Amino acid sequence: PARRPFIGGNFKCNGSLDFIKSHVAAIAAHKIPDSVDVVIAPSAVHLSTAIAANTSKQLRIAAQNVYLEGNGAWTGETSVEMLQDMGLKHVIVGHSERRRIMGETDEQSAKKAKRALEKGMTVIFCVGETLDERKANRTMEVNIAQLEALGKELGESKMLWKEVVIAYEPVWSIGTGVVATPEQAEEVHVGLRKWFVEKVAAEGAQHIRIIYGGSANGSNNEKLGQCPNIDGFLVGGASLKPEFMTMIDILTKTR
Amino acid sequence: PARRPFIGGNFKCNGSLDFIKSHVAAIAAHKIPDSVDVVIAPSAVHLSTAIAANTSKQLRIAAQNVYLEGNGAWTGETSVEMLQDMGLKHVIVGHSERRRIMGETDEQSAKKAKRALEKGMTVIFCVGETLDERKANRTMEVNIAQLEALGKELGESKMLWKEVVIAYEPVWSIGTGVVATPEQAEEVHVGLRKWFVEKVAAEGAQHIRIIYGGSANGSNNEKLGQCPNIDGFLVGGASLKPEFMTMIDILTKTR
């Protein structure tokens, strides 16, 4: 019932060509053990520059988003086919910025994930509740609904769930500095784990990785990483900084 | 009251790395006179590959979309800053696939265009009505509304309108093979021209370029290109093929 630690860095809409070259080189120069998964997600226009700068045998490059159709008449959108042609294994789907600011629906996120998973990618599937939703006592209702939408698309497929990494990021913690307490985070992760047991049964559930995000940084990650159901982190702001490497180290010696 | 001919090729969600290299090289090998603007818009993940393959002193690379915020927490989105850092001058905004399939609102398209124009880019701003809208006799009402949204953001700014290229693409003509007749297209373009006269006055209006798109190809472009208010084309499917170069030639000898 053991799971490989995972840390992802979401650069979001940040970076210049020079920054991508210099920052990817810095991360690639860091010692990354073979025991943990480390990925970084540059902006789409920077993926090929990042791949060229990535001299690490461990670090992987991920995309921040992908569309729910194959190649075709989808102006402004990227297909799974394009990502795989570039050699990428990982993609972030359902980030709360896309759900809450850009109108990506629960079904849209689920259909994106399904298509990527079917084609063999690993999907970092994001869920999370807003401050108001938590205030209304709907935290689990909201997170479960987002997962249920995925479940509707994936059913109980062994193949499909294998390469899902759930990222729980309370929306009130994203970019705000208001990191969840270890108790708040673990509480939600236990709820999600229980949901997985019901949907794919106990064995299937034991291997689903759940990472935390929302103001995770070099200074606060250790205590969170000690929680049994927190398998690692999705890191936004700190992923643009040297402290990202500190987080890699900490996740390693903790888990 | 004369305007430089313009042809843009929108690759949409198509291409592999090898295809971008080979197809951009083929277009770049073609003779392009200094008298016309020729741009191609690869998918975002392919922009840097396209730039590297573009050995032409005339051909320009454009983006298919851009977001309405600067760098920041906008997962999956590209900023104007990123495009300019990569050396791009042109971007497509408001393509009807984004408006009609992906929920991009008239205001969102307008705000994207305004931000790009303020920063110095040339924006290919797309407008168009659906078959049902035309059937309901609302063709001009719809197209004008889309333009009015832009006008609300740009006002009567001389600086801002200077680098707008309007692309009229009837939605019923996009990817369907059902190209507009020269009469249908010119009729709408005259309506748009009249609108510009009212909004920015006659002088400002005389320099706004209006291109046609929607099943424009190597075989049907000549007659359309002969229309006084059709300053060129936005080309989807044919832009992925050798006939794109034929269209460049035709636009040149016609206008």
Author numbering:
A (entry chain A), B (entry chain A): 2 to 256
The authors write:
Since Giardia lacks oxidative phosphorylation and depends on glycolysis as its major ATP source, it has been proposed that disrupting this pathway could hinder the survival of the parasite; therefore, glycolytic enzymes have been considered potential pharmacological targets. Our results indicated that derivatization of C222, a non-interfacial residue located near the surface of the protein and 10-15 Å away from the active site, specifically inactivates the enzyme. C222 is at the end of loop 7, with its lateral chain positioned in a hydrophobic pocket formed mainly by carbon atoms of residues N218, G219, E223, F234, M248, and I251.
The relevance of polarity or charge in the inactivation of GlTIM by modification of C222 became apparent when cysteine was replaced by asparagine or aspartic acid (their volumes are similar to that of cysteine, but the former is polar and the other is negatively charged). The Ki of C222V matched the Ki for the WT enzyme, whereas the Ki values for C222M and C222N were, respectively, 3.7 and 6.4 fold higher; C222F showed a Ki that is 17-fold higher than that of WT GlTIM. WTC and C222NC produced high-resolution structures (1.6Å and 1.45Å, respectively), whereas C222DC was solved at a resolution of 2.7Å. The structural comparison between WTC and C222NC showed that these structures are almost identical with a Cα RMSD of 0.38 Å2. The larger differences were observed in the region of residues 198-207, which corresponds to a small mobile loop in the middle of helix 6. In both structures the architecture of the catalytic site is conserved; the ligand is positioned correctly and the geometry of the active site residues is preserved. The result is intriguing because the perturbations in catalysis and stability of C222N do not reflect on discernible structural changes in the crystallographic structure. Thus, it is possible that the presence of bound ligand stabilizes the catalytically competent conformation of the active site, masking or preventing the conformational perturbations induced by modification of C222 with MMTS.
